Write a protein that binds this ligand. Structure first.
Ligand SMILES: [Mg+2]
Length: 455
C-alpha cells in the first residue's frame, strides 16, 4: 500500500500478509525509531479490536517492542479512538492499534500513533518502513529488555467523554437511543456511555465477537436496512451504529432515515463554534458548503485541506483548530483526541438533542439545504494531468477554479469537483447546489470539461 503502509496504517488478511512475523517486525521497527529519535526507553501503548487474530498479532507486536527495549502498556480490547486517547493519557512515546476496522473477519492490520495519539506522521512512517524492510533493529541488551503491564481504560475513557458534555441536561430529557455496535470494540463502550449520560438504551449486536455474526462491521446504509426498521419499530428518538473499531458513528432519525455524516458534523460544529464564539473549522475541499454556512454563522474561519486520512487531524493540530471533520462526518474534537471519535460525536449529539426540545429529524432538516450528485469515470494514463487540463479550460471559460485538491469549479450557489483517485484509475465528479437542477447542471458541466479534456 506504499510499500508497507496505506493512508492510516496497513491491513491485509491474517496469516497471509498480516502474519505474526509481520506484526513483530513492525514492533521492532517502531521501537527502534522511537529509540533513535532520542528516547532511552520508549513507552508504547498497544490496543486492539475484537478480531479473532488480534490476540496472536498483539503478542507478536509486543514481543517485538519489548525485544528492542520499549516498555509497553497493553490496553486490551478497545475502540481505536480509546487507544489513541490512552496513548496521550499515559504520556506514551507512541501507540499501536491492531485492527482492520470495518473489514471482514479474516482481515487485520496495524495503525501506529504519535505520542499524542494521532496517526503516525508520514515522515516518521517512512523511517519505520525503511527499518522494517532492512530489518535494521536496535535489539536490546538482556538487562534493557522492556516490560509490559496491562491497563483497563474503559471507565477512564468513558469518564473523559462525559466530562465534555452536559450530563444533567441529558438525564433530564432521558433520550431513548438504539445502538448497533456491530459486535465490535464499541460494544464495550458506547452502550455504557449512553446509559451513564442518562439515556434509555437498547442495543443490537452488542456482544463483542470477532466473527462479526451480524454482518461485516461497516455501517453503510445498505447494511443498516434492518437496523433502520428497528429504530422506527422501537419508537426510539434516534439510532446510532458504529463500525468494527468504533471510530465511526452513523445516525438514523426517528423515522428510520439514514442521516448523512456531514449533517451531524454540521450539527456538532454549530454547537462547538457557538460555544467558542468563533474559532477555526477544518475540513476537506469535498465537504458540503453547509459547513461554511455554520462557520460564517459564528464568525469562525474555515480551512479546506486535500482529501485523505489524517490530513484534517494534522491540520487541526498544526493550526490549533477548533473542530474538524470530513465528507462522511468523522468529527474530530481536538480537546478530546486528534482523531475521529464516533463515541464523542454521539455524546455531543445526544447533548444537543437533549437541549433542543426537538425531534432528531427536525434538528437535521432545519440545517441549510443542499443537493449533491456523484459520478465516477474510468481513466488511465496521466489521470492527474487530465484534471489539470479541466482546470485550465474552466479558467479560460471564465470559471473560478480552486485547485487545492483537483479541479473545483466554484459558484455562488454551489460547486463541481473533478478529482482523480490516488489509488484507483478513476476521476470522480462531485457536485452540490441548493437545488437538484443546479446540482445536475454543475455535474454535467464537470463531465463536459472532462470529456473534452479526454479528446
Ligand atoms: Mg474504523
Amino acid at each position: 500500500m506504499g510499500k508497507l503502509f496505506g493512508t492510516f496504517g496497513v491491513r491485509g488478511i491474517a496469516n497471509e500478509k498480516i502474519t505474526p512475523e509481520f506484526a513483530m517486525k513492525i514492533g521492532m521497527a517502531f521501537g527502534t525509531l522511537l529509540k533513535r529519535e532520542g528516547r532511552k526507553k520508549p513507552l508504547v501503548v498497544v490496543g486492539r479490536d475484537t478480531r479473532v487474530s488480534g490476540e496472536m498479532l498483539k503478542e507478536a507486536l509486543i514481543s517485538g517492542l519489548l525485544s528492542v527495549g520499549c516498555d509497553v502498556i497493553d490496553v486490551g480490547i478497545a475502540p481505536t479512538p480509546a487507544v489513541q486517547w490512552a496513548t496521550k493519557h499515559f504520556n506514551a512515546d507512541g501507540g499501536a492499534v491492531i485492527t482492520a476496522s470495518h473489514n471482514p473477519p479474516e482481515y487485520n492490520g496495524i495503525k501506529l500513533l504519535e505520542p499524542n495519539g494521532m496517526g503516525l506522521k508520514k515522515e516518521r512512517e517512512a523511517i519505520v518502513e525503511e527499518l522494517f524492510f532492512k530489518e535494521d533493529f536496535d535489539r536490546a541488551k538482556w538487562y534493557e529488555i522492556g516490560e509490559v503491564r496491562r491497563e483497563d481504560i474503559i471507565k477512564p475513557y468513558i469518564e473523559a467523554i462525559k466530562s465534555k458534555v452536559d450530563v444533567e441536561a441529558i438525564k433530564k430529557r432521558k433520550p431513548f437511543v438504539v445502538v448497533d455496535t456491530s459486535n465490535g470494540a464499541g460494544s464495550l463502550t458506547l452502550p455504557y456511555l449512553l446509559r451513564e449520560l442518562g439515556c434509555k438504551v437498547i442495543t443490537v449486536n452488542a456482544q463483542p465477537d470477532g466473527y462479526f455474526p451480524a454482518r461485516n462491521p461497516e455501517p453503510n446504509e445498505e447494511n443498516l436496512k434492518e437496523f433502520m426498521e428497528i429504530v422506527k419499530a422501537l419508537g426510539a428518538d434516534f439510532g446510532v451504529a458504529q463500525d468494527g473499531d468504533a471510530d465511526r458513528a452513523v445516525f438514523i432519525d426517528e423515522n428510520g432515515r439514514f442521516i448523512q455524516g456531514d449533517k451531524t458534523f454540521a450539527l456538532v460544529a454549530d454547537a462547538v463554534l457557538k460555544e467558542k464564539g468563533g474559532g477555526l473549522l477544518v475540513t476537506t475541499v469535498a465537504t458540503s458548503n453547509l459547513l461554511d454556512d455554520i462557520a460564517k454563522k459564528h464568525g469562525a474561519k474555515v480551512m479546506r485541506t486535500k482529501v485523505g486520512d489524517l490530513i484534517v487531524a494534522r491540520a487541526l493540530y498544526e493550526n490549533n483548530g477548533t473542530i474538524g471533520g470530513e465528507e462522511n462526518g468523522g468529527v474530530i474534537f481536538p480537546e478530546h483526541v486528534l482523531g475521529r471519535d464516533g463515541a464523542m460525536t454521539v455524546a455531543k449529539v445526544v447533548e444537543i438533542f437533549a437541549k433542543s426540545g426537538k425531534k432528531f429529524s427536525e434538528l437535521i432538516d432545519e440545517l441549510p439545504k443542499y443537493y449533491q450528485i456523484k459520478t465516477k469515470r474510468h481513466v488511465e494514463g496521466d489521470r492527474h494531468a487530465i484534471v489539470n487540463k479541466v482546470a485550465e479550460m474552466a479558467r479560460e471559460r471564465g470559471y473560478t477554479v480552486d485547485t487545492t485538491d483537483g479541479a473545483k469549479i466554484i459558484f455562488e450557489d454551489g460547486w463541481v469537483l473533478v478529482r482523480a483517485s490516488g489509488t484507483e484509475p478513476i476521476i470522480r465528479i462531485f457536485s452540490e447546489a441548493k437545488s437538484k437542477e443546479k446540482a445536475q447542471e454543475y455535474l454535467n458541466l464537470g463531465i463536459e470539461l472532462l470529456e473534452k479534456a479526454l479528446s
